Amino acid sequence: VTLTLWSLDRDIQPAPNLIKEFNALNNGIKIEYRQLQFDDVVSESMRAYSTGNAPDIIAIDNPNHAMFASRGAFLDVTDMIAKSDVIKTENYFPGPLKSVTWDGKYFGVPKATNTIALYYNKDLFKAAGLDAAKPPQTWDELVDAARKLTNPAKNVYGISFSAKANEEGTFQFLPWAQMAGATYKNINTDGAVKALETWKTLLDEKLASPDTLTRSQWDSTATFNAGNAAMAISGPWEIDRMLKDAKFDWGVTLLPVPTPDAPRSSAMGDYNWAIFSKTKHPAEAFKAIEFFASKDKDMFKNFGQLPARSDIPVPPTGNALKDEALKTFVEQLKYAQPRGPSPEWPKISKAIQDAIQGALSGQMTPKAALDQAAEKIKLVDG
């Protein structure tokens, strides 16, 4: 049997390397890889499905999963998963599992994951009289610390993050709303408004740069590495550069909660495996995904990517700060929540982006902005 697999993974990233190993097996299945190019995974992929030309297997960005699953494009793998001795749903973090779920059925298997958390400069904490062993755990503590850490004389903002008018702004904002008891289907609760007002306060009180509105997570975190922001909300992808560039002692803690007993959340990036529904070789496609999952234990070591799984430890990385950071990130992943899952996620995300921009620019109040977003979202998902 010959299978086809499409992914954005580059030559040194997991998919093509896993494919080479799978093909080397004595198992009568062979996979041919197509490397998808930037920004095309979704467009090319539902073009291909509509014309009967989809691959057998795809690695799809998690917020896109529900669109394919709800429209019949992905194979229902519920029973296959149940029978598998390799793929066990209890191994996975809850958020990634939810992203492959539609209508009480599994339509894929998580491939990898990431999240965001709160980096902090322990040396600037000490200079401000803050105990570096006790980083902020609530939104109020976070704002208090950001104030104490802001230092115009030395061009330091207390915090950096991203509210960019792209997917990153929604990615960063949604967990705050979720911790306050809101969802994408209900994004204008007074709790969600409090989240957005908190962001507005950070900007208006000069505790976060105005460039928060236009800057990527990566570019925001560069300012933390340079010592111009005392805290940063970003992901595990930052660590190696931070080790090279940040000339200070630093730690990482979970994204703070609005009140001590509030449910935790954070953002959730990266991809899922899926089988296209008209594959002529469903059993063999599933066996390939089982093989990939069986190697999740080696993913971080080999590729520097985190499995979507709670049963796999992060191996020692050779650096103590990196180990501690990743300890926090894997704890955070217990609480990471998906965007959606919604077949109309792109439209919904744009509505939320427009609300963030409208509020933080002062064009609309936070409540007026989120009321407008909720109205748009109710047309398409509820």
Q: Which residues bind Cl ion (CB under 5 A)?
A: 52, 54, 278
CB of 60 to Cl ion, least distance (A): 14
- How many Cα atoms sit within 13 Å of 317 on the Cβ side? 21
Residue 75 vs 377, nearer CB to Cl ion: 75
Query: Residue count at the site for K ion (CB under 5 A)?
Result: 2
Closest-CA residue to 220 (of 169, 153, 185, 149): 169
Closest-CA residue to 64 (of 353, 347, 345, 377): 345
Cis peptide before 341 (omega within 30 of 0): yes
Answer with the entry of K ion, Cl ion, none that 52 interacts with (C-beta below 5 to 8 A by kind).
Cl ion
Residue 44 vs 144, nearer CB to Cl ion: 44
Residue 88 vs 154, nearer CB to K ion: 88
CB of 282 to Cl ion, least distance (A): 12
CB of 244 to Cl ion, least distance (A): 45
Answer with the entry of Cl ion, K ion, none that 88 interacts with (C-beta below 5 to 8 A by kind).
K ion
Rg (CA), the chain: 21
Q: How far, in Å, CA of 118 to CA of 250, rounded?
A: 10
Q: How far, in Å, CA of 182 to CA of 255, rounded?
A: 16
Q: How far, in Å, CA of 136 to CA of 154, rounded?
A: 23
Residue 101 vs 328, nearer CB to K ion: 101
Q: By CB under 5 A, what part of segment 61-90 binds K ion? A: 84, 88
Residue 10 vs 88, nearer CB to K ion: 88
Answer with the entry of K ion, Cl ion, none that 84 interacts with (C-beta below 5 to 8 A by kind).
K ion
**Can you give the length of the chain in residues?**
382
Answer with the entry of K ion, Cl ion, none that 71 interacts with (C-beta below 5 to 8 A by kind).
none
Answer with the entry of Cl ion, K ion, none that 231 interacts with (C-beta below 5 to 8 A by kind).
none
Q: How far, in Å, CA of 68 to CA of 222, rounded?
A: 36
Q: DSSP of 103-139, one letter per residue?
A: TTEE--EE--BB--EEEEEHHHHHHTT--TTS---BH
Answer with the entry of Cl ion, K ion, none that 230 interacts with (C-beta below 5 to 8 A by kind).
none
Answer with the entry of Cl ion, K ion, none that 278 interacts with (C-beta below 5 to 8 A by kind).
Cl ion
CB of 289 to Cl ion, least distance (A): 17
Residue 216 vs 277, nearer CB to Cl ion: 277
- Roughly what angle, to the nearest 10 degrees, separates helices 366-378 and 345-360? 170
Task: State which residue has the least CB distance to Cl ion.
Answer: 54
Residue 244 vs 280, nearer CB to Cl ion: 280
CB of 51 to Cl ion, least distance (A): 7
Q: How far, in Å, CA of 185 to CA of 139, rounded?
A: 23
Query: Which residues of this chain interact with K ion, rule CB under 5 A?
Result: 84, 88
